[PDB]
Amino acid sequence: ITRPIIELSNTVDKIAEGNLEAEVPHQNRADEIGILAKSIERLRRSLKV
Amino acid sequence: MSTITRPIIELSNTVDKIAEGNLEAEVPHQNRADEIGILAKSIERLRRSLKVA
């Protein structure tokens, strides 16, 4: 749980700095980390568009 | 369960609202001393960055 959350926190920081190309990890987990990851991916795509 | 799962769901819903263009909704859990807190601060920084745009 701890490491993936740190990782996704990192991912959100890169998106904030304008890097809309960095891959979002953990999109395929079957739990709540998975759901958070799918959210961040959708956010990433929404900002590209 | 209440210490980890629920906050993650909540922040997940917060990211969805930002994605829909709602840059005014408050980001919960900014004051936790753990990794949820770190994530929450990240999302708040993202939110502010998108307003400035």
Distance separating alpha carbons of residues B39 and B22, to the nearest angstrom: 19
Put simply, the answer to whether B42 touches A12 (Cβ < 8 Å) is yes
Q: Do A9 and B49 touch (CB under 8 A)?
A: no
Q: After which residues is chain B broken (C to N over 2.5 A)?
A: none
A22 touches chain B (CB under 8 A): no
Q: Which domains does chain B have, with CATH numbers?
A: 1-53 (1.10.8.500)
- Which of B8, B15, B42 has its CB closest to that of A13? B42
